[PDB]
Amino acid sequence: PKQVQEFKQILKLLKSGSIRAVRVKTNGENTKFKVRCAKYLYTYICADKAKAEELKKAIPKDIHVVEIAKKAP
Amino acid sequence: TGHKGFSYKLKLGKKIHQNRGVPQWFRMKTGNTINYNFKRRHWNRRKMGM
Amino acid sequence: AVRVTYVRKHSYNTKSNGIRIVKTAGGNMTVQHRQKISNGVRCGDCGCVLAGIRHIRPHQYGWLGKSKRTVTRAYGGVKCHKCVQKKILRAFLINEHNLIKLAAA
Amino acid sequence: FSCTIDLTNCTDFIEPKKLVTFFRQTIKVQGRAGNTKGIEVKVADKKVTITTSSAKLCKRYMKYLMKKYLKKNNLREWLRVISDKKDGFELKF
RNA sequence: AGGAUUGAAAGGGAAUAAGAUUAAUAGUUCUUAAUCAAGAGAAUGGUAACAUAUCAUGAACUUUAAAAUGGAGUGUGAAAAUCUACGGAAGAGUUCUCUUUUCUUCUUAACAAAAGUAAAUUCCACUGAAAUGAAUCAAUCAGAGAAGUGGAAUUUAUUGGCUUUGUAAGAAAUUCAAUGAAUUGUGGUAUUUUUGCAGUCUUCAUAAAAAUUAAAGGGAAUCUUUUGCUCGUACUAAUAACCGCAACAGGUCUCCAAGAAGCAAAAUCUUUAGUUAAAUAGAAUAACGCAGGUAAGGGAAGUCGGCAACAUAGCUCUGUAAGUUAGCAAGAAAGAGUAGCUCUGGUGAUUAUCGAAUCAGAACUUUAAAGGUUAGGGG
RNA sequence: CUGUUGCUUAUAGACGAUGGCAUCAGAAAUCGGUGUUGUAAGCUUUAGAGUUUCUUAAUCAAUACUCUCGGGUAUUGAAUG
């Protein structure tokens, strides 16, 4: 698993065709966007809800998105 | 041992297979004298030397 | 105090059977197989350990970056920087002497 | 620091008023019994509260005295002090 | 181009971890997360030490290094365990006598990242030491160049040692409710183990090789995807699975390893785990036995012979002969002290607070104190 | 008549035997006597060297005083009831 550091690395990651699955985890403070690629599981820790919403707009429509919360799926 | 050769394990399996008794139907044949297998052994009674 | 067991079938404390006990979830301690300690490169002349090259197993240099197993210098990775300075002086000074000794002394 | 006692089911077995006289005479703020002047237990109506900030108190201390109190009147066998996860303690059978 | 075969389930070796699961297999299954091999699709920077997600070409031939190398003892970095300080959360125990009390949980993998930040060693640049300095527990070092300042590199159980981070809280542990909810701080100038490191000592002892890999000198030439075959894998490993004719008090190689107390991995007691059965019992309580003991007065008179038993026994202080290969004899011999309770002083760190068990001293009291266990008889 | 059996029976005893009683049997507690050890537990003498804290107010304190010639034990192979 690799951690991306800024937004522009994960905007570029999503618009590529190599995505395989996205899981969104909501925690007490932050939100993690664990994009599952072919090799690694890249994740982005965001601390602003507005920035989190922008990421969900950029997610393609043919890809499955899983939302995880205080209860495991 | 835990580690064993392939052929040695098959000769161990056959020794397990030959430690069986006469089936009941075979004992009901006419003029039958074979009732018990006298080639029987138990792990704690006789070591099979192999 | 949690006591552990060897995971593999080796039962003797040989050099290749080194273990490290680490902690895991719930207070359980598991067994990790730890690597052996290697030696670094040495200067071919003075036998001193070179700088800039890591001390890892010989096959692990294949996984190393191509620039992380040698130093960018003539005889890099086989000779110390002092081992090379004397090489240059020997090559130059001797050749200079052989020009005044022979060749119309 | 505020700690409330939930007698919403066993108010009859332990009426609130008997707790206050027992509680305010029992907590050892600095080693003595009954010298709880800086403790404001008050009535709390339905429940029994402490809501004291001036002195050094602990939630685990509150469960200690109550369990001691339950043994005082010999009714600990039926009851059971269980925290409500809401900075208070409630009693169950 | 160079020497054939075999020879190690403890020597060398490409690469996997956590959780769950079975009546029984699990670094092998499941979930999740990785790694390795084999493939398929003629460069810059730094004074320098040296540094740059592949980068940034490098054939024959040759060389170098790694794999790959004793032991002792001392100091020290780090992790774990134990202990302990502060701050709480949840549950349990005691409670007529007290106890803001005692106890349990508060966790995190492989592989990678690089906020913050260590110890030790070796090198590089500036300058040139004597009024000689520098430094360690010990040493040890210096004009073929010390100390100082500024740098580079490597090691420290995977990337880069520790904290932290992705993994990853969704797991797991502790509780509550009837599947669903709650929390998961920060330290220590303490001890042990493990793991490295640094120099010191020691040898008429110098403490393996290959497979395999990398680099150099040289200048010949011009991210995605597929596969990963054969065999072992159950169980005991022993006061019942092994060898002794046996469910034989005999023998048989290893790994992990809590509290008290003490110099001690000693004797003795307990915790986690295991077990209460391990060639049958009950009654009576004769002689003679096997094992463990005690004894008036005398004290080896017993006997081949102090055989057996008794006796001394830890620590501190004083003191210690003849003889001698001058090293020893020596713990010679001999004498004094030792308990409990309440106090006082010494030994440090940071600028008053914080911590280490250790030494010495003084009153008071008592059953006058190593001796429950362990523990030299002397000449 | 005698034996078994009962009193987990004694003046007896390896086992048998022997001795006693067997319904006015027997056993059991409790009580008193008789012995052993040495003054229980709770509260009180500031007993109490000192410390500590409020600053004569407490504490904590080995040991010590009164209750206390106490308490505990006592047939099990002791004696009355």
mmCIF file of N, CA, C and O (backbone and C1' of nucleotides) in Angstrom, chain E residues 47-72:
data_model
loop_
_atom_site.group_PDB
_atom_site.id
_atom_site.type_symbol
_atom_site.label_atom_id
_atom_site.label_comp_id
_atom_site.label_asym_id
_atom_site.label_seq_id
_atom_site.Cartn_x
_atom_site.Cartn_y
_atom_site.Cartn_z
ATOM 1 P P U E 47 31.734 22.811 -5.682
ATOM 2 O "O5'" U E 47 32.893 21.737 -5.876
ATOM 3 C "C5'" U E 47 33.969 21.970 -6.772
ATOM 4 C "C4'" U E 47 35.282 21.537 -6.171
ATOM 5 C "C3'" U E 47 35.321 20.119 -5.624
ATOM 6 O "O3'" U E 47 35.671 19.194 -6.634
ATOM 7 C "C1'" U E 47 36.294 21.643 -4.071
ATOM 8 P P A E 48 34.868 17.822 -6.807
ATOM 9 O "O5'" A E 48 35.325 16.950 -5.560
ATOM 10 C "C5'" A E 48 36.674 16.539 -5.411
ATOM 11 C "C4'" A E 48 36.933 16.090 -4.002
ATOM 12 C "C3'" A E 48 35.974 15.035 -3.484
ATOM 13 O "O3'" A E 48 36.420 13.729 -3.798
ATOM 14 C "C1'" A E 48 36.101 16.821 -1.937
ATOM 15 P P A E 49 35.393 12.607 -4.298
ATOM 16 O "O5'" A E 49 35.031 11.810 -2.973
ATOM 17 C "C5'" A E 49 36.050 11.236 -2.170
ATOM 18 C "C4'" A E 49 35.673 11.252 -0.712
ATOM 19 C "C3'" A E 49 34.363 10.566 -0.360
ATOM 20 O "O3'" A E 49 34.506 9.167 -0.187
ATOM 21 C "C1'" A E 49 34.422 12.706 0.633
ATOM 22 P P C E 50 34.067 8.145 -1.345
ATOM 23 O "O5'" C E 50 32.726 8.764 -1.928
ATOM 24 C "C5'" C E 50 31.463 8.390 -1.405
ATOM 25 C "C4'" C E 50 30.531 9.570 -1.371
ATOM 26 C "C3'" C E 50 29.241 9.430 -2.155
ATOM 27 O "O3'" C E 50 28.242 8.675 -1.498
ATOM 28 C "C1'" C E 50 30.227 11.491 -2.675
ATOM 29 P P A E 51 27.131 7.906 -2.366
ATOM 30 O "O5'" A E 51 26.175 9.062 -2.894
ATOM 31 C "C5'" A E 51 25.497 9.919 -1.990
ATOM 32 C "C4'" A E 51 24.703 10.971 -2.720
ATOM 33 C "C3'" A E 51 23.604 10.452 -3.625
ATOM 34 O "O3'" A E 51 22.425 10.140 -2.910
ATOM 35 C "C1'" A E 51 24.861 12.093 -4.770
ATOM 36 P P U E 52 21.280 9.256 -3.598
ATOM 37 O "O5'" U E 52 20.648 10.237 -4.679
ATOM 38 C "C5'" U E 52 19.918 9.726 -5.780
ATOM 39 C "C4'" U E 52 19.644 10.789 -6.810
ATOM 40 C "C3'" U E 52 19.025 10.292 -8.104
ATOM 41 O "O3'" U E 52 17.628 10.086 -8.008
ATOM 42 C "C1'" U E 52 20.848 11.686 -8.611
ATOM 43 P P A E 53 17.074 8.676 -7.476
ATOM 44 O "O5'" A E 53 15.866 8.335 -8.454
ATOM 45 C "C5'" A E 53 14.531 8.653 -8.098
ATOM 46 C "C4'" A E 53 13.677 7.413 -8.028
ATOM 47 C "C3'" A E 53 13.788 6.468 -9.214
ATOM 48 O "O3'" A E 53 14.914 5.613 -9.131
ATOM 49 C "C1'" A E 53 11.511 6.828 -8.704
ATOM 50 P P U E 54 15.931 5.498 -10.368
ATOM 51 O "O5'" U E 54 16.035 3.932 -10.641
ATOM 52 C "C5'" U E 54 15.042 3.259 -11.402
ATOM 53 C "C4'" U E 54 15.660 2.449 -12.511
ATOM 54 C "C3'" U E 54 16.902 3.052 -13.145
ATOM 55 O "O3'" U E 54 18.077 2.809 -12.394
ATOM 56 C "C1'" U E 54 15.420 2.353 -14.842
ATOM 57 P P C E 55 19.193 3.955 -12.252
ATOM 58 O "O5'" C E 55 20.112 3.752 -13.535
ATOM 59 C "C5'" C E 55 20.278 4.793 -14.489
ATOM 60 C "C4'" C E 55 19.325 4.641 -15.646
ATOM 61 C "C3'" C E 55 19.747 5.316 -16.948
ATOM 62 O "O3'" C E 55 19.331 4.507 -18.046
ATOM 63 C "C1'" C E 55 17.652 6.156 -16.269
ATOM 64 P P A E 56 20.405 3.604 -18.825
ATOM 65 O "O5'" A E 56 21.422 4.670 -19.428
ATOM 66 C "C5'" A E 56 20.993 5.625 -20.387
ATOM 67 C "C4'" A E 56 21.679 6.951 -20.180
ATOM 68 C "C3'" A E 56 23.138 6.887 -19.764
ATOM 69 O "O3'" A E 56 24.035 6.627 -20.829
ATOM 70 C "C1'" A E 56 22.010 8.426 -18.390
ATOM 71 P P U E 57 25.345 5.735 -20.558
ATOM 72 O "O5'" U E 57 25.070 4.401 -21.381
ATOM 73 C "C5'" U E 57 23.897 3.643 -21.135
ATOM 74 C "C4'" U E 57 23.765 2.474 -22.073
ATOM 75 C "C3'" U E 57 24.676 1.290 -21.812
ATOM 76 O "O3'" U E 57 24.222 0.465 -20.752
ATOM 77 C "C1'" U E 57 24.636 1.769 -24.125
ATOM 78 P P G E 58 25.273 -0.197 -19.730
ATOM 79 O "O5'" G E 58 26.301 -0.963 -20.671
ATOM 80 C "C5'" G E 58 25.890 -2.079 -21.451
ATOM 81 C "C4'" G E 58 26.960 -2.484 -22.432
ATOM 82 C "C3'" G E 58 28.176 -3.156 -21.795
ATOM 83 O "O3'" G E 58 28.638 -4.247 -22.585
ATOM 84 C "C1'" G E 58 28.862 -1.253 -23.032
ATOM 85 P P A E 59 29.368 -5.480 -21.860
ATOM 86 O "O5'" A E 59 29.788 -6.444 -23.051
ATOM 87 C "C5'" A E 59 28.873 -7.384 -23.588
ATOM 88 C "C4'" A E 59 29.500 -8.146 -24.721
ATOM 89 C "C3'" A E 59 30.785 -8.881 -24.378
ATOM 90 O "O3'" A E 59 30.561 -10.142 -23.773
ATOM 91 C "C1'" A E 59 31.136 -7.594 -26.309
ATOM 92 P P A E 60 31.536 -10.659 -22.606
ATOM 93 O "O5'" A E 60 32.816 -11.197 -23.384
ATOM 94 C "C5'" A E 60 32.699 -12.223 -24.356
ATOM 95 C "C4'" A E 60 33.953 -12.332 -25.182
ATOM 96 C "C3'" A E 60 35.225 -12.629 -24.407
ATOM 97 O "O3'" A E 60 35.399 -14.010 -24.150
ATOM 98 C "C1'" A E 60 35.599 -10.807 -25.854
ATOM 99 P P C E 61 35.656 -14.530 -22.655
ATOM 100 O "O5'" C E 61 37.019 -13.826 -22.232
ATOM 101 C "C5'" C E 61 38.243 -14.163 -22.865
ATOM 102 C "C4'" C E 61 39.321 -13.167 -22.527
ATOM 103 C "C3'" C E 61 39.644 -13.014 -21.049
ATOM 104 O "O3'" C E 61 40.541 -13.999 -20.572
ATOM 105 C "C1'" C E 61 39.350 -10.883 -22.009
ATOM 106 P P U E 62 40.396 -14.565 -19.078
ATOM 107 O "O5'" U E 62 40.907 -13.373 -18.155
ATOM 108 C "C5'" U E 62 42.290 -13.071 -18.049
ATOM 109 C "C4'" U E 62 42.525 -11.832 -17.221
ATOM 110 C "C3'" U E 62 42.083 -11.904 -15.769
ATOM 111 O "O3'" U E 62 43.054 -12.520 -14.943
ATOM 112 C "C1'" U E 62 41.338 -9.877 -16.737
ATOM 113 P P U E 63 42.653 -13.103 -13.502
ATOM 114 O "O5'" U E 63 42.359 -11.811 -12.615
ATOM 115 C "C5'" U E 63 43.410 -10.948 -12.202
ATOM 116 C "C4'" U E 63 42.882 -9.678 -11.578
ATOM 117 C "C3'" U E 63 42.124 -9.840 -10.271
ATOM 118 O "O3'" U E 63 42.995 -9.929 -9.158
ATOM 119 C "C1'" U E 63 40.934 -8.387 -11.716
ATOM 120 P P U E 64 42.511 -10.629 -7.800
ATOM 121 O "O5'" U E 64 41.458 -9.604 -7.185
ATOM 122 C "C5'" U E 64 41.863 -8.323 -6.726
ATOM 123 C "C4'" U E 64 40.680 -7.492 -6.297
ATOM 124 C "C3'" U E 64 39.753 -8.138 -5.286
ATOM 125 O "O3'" U E 64 40.242 -8.039 -3.965
ATOM 126 C "C1'" U E 64 38.476 -7.161 -7.017
ATOM 127 P P A E 65 39.890 -9.175 -2.893
ATOM 128 O "O5'" A E 65 38.369 -8.888 -2.519
ATOM 129 C "C5'" A E 65 37.993 -7.664 -1.912
ATOM 130 C "C4'" A E 65 36.505 -7.428 -1.989
ATOM 131 C "C3'" A E 65 35.617 -8.489 -1.368
ATOM 132 O "O3'" A E 65 35.521 -8.366 0.037
ATOM 133 C "C1'" A E 65 34.758 -7.869 -3.477
ATOM 134 P P A E 66 35.143 -9.637 0.938
ATOM 135 O "O5'" A E 66 33.609 -9.903 0.612
ATOM 136 C "C5'" A E 66 32.606 -8.975 0.999
ATOM 137 C "C4'" A E 66 31.249 -9.400 0.500
ATOM 138 C "C3'" A E 66 30.765 -10.755 0.988
ATOM 139 O "O3'" A E 66 30.123 -10.664 2.243
ATOM 140 C "C1'" A E 66 30.453 -10.579 -1.356
ATOM 141 P P A E 67 30.244 -11.861 3.295
ATOM 142 O "O5'" A E 67 29.520 -13.078 2.571
ATOM 143 C "C5'" A E 67 28.116 -13.073 2.362
ATOM 144 C "C4'" A E 67 27.663 -14.333 1.668
ATOM 145 C "C3'" A E 67 28.184 -15.628 2.258
ATOM 146 O "O3'" A E 67 27.414 -16.058 3.363
ATOM 147 C "C1'" A E 67 28.472 -15.656 -0.085
ATOM 148 P P A E 68 28.081 -16.933 4.527
ATOM 149 O "O5'" A E 68 29.350 -16.087 4.976
ATOM 150 C "C5'" A E 68 30.167 -16.525 6.052
ATOM 151 C "C4'" A E 68 31.615 -16.168 5.835
ATOM 152 C "C3'" A E 68 31.866 -14.806 5.198
ATOM 153 O "O3'" A E 68 33.079 -14.269 5.718
ATOM 154 C "C1'" A E 68 32.837 -16.476 3.868
ATOM 155 P P U E 69 33.054 -13.240 6.947
ATOM 156 O "O5'" U E 69 33.707 -14.059 8.140
ATOM 157 C "C5'" U E 69 32.911 -14.490 9.233
ATOM 158 C "C4'" U E 69 33.534 -15.655 9.958
ATOM 159 C "C3'" U E 69 35.042 -15.563 10.187
ATOM 160 O "O3'" U E 69 35.361 -16.161 11.443
ATOM 161 C "C1'" U E 69 34.545 -17.527 8.984
ATOM 162 P P G E 70 35.201 -15.328 12.807
ATOM 163 O "O5'" G E 70 35.653 -16.356 13.935
ATOM 164 C "C5'" G E 70 35.142 -17.678 13.958
ATOM 165 C "C4'" G E 70 35.734 -18.484 15.086
ATOM 166 C "C3'" G E 70 35.374 -18.035 16.489
ATOM 167 O "O3'" G E 70 34.096 -18.473 16.904
ATOM 168 C "C1'" G E 70 37.692 -18.420 16.368
ATOM 169 P P G E 71 33.203 -17.537 17.851
ATOM 170 O "O5'" G E 71 34.022 -17.486 19.215
ATOM 171 C "C5'" G E 71 34.134 -18.643 20.028
ATOM 172 C "C4'" G E 71 35.159 -18.471 21.119
ATOM 173 C "C3'" G E 71 34.889 -17.379 22.135
ATOM 174 O "O3'" G E 71 33.942 -17.751 23.117
ATOM 175 C "C1'" G E 71 37.131 -17.254 21.443
ATOM 176 P P A E 72 33.016 -16.629 23.789
ATOM 177 O "O5'" A E 72 33.971 -15.927 24.850
ATOM 178 C "C5'" A E 72 34.571 -16.674 25.895
ATOM 179 C "C4'" A E 72 35.650 -15.887 26.592
ATOM 180 C "C3'" A E 72 35.214 -14.580 27.227
ATOM 181 O "O3'" A E 72 34.647 -14.769 28.511
ATOM 182 C "C1'" A E 72 37.177 -14.229 25.966
#
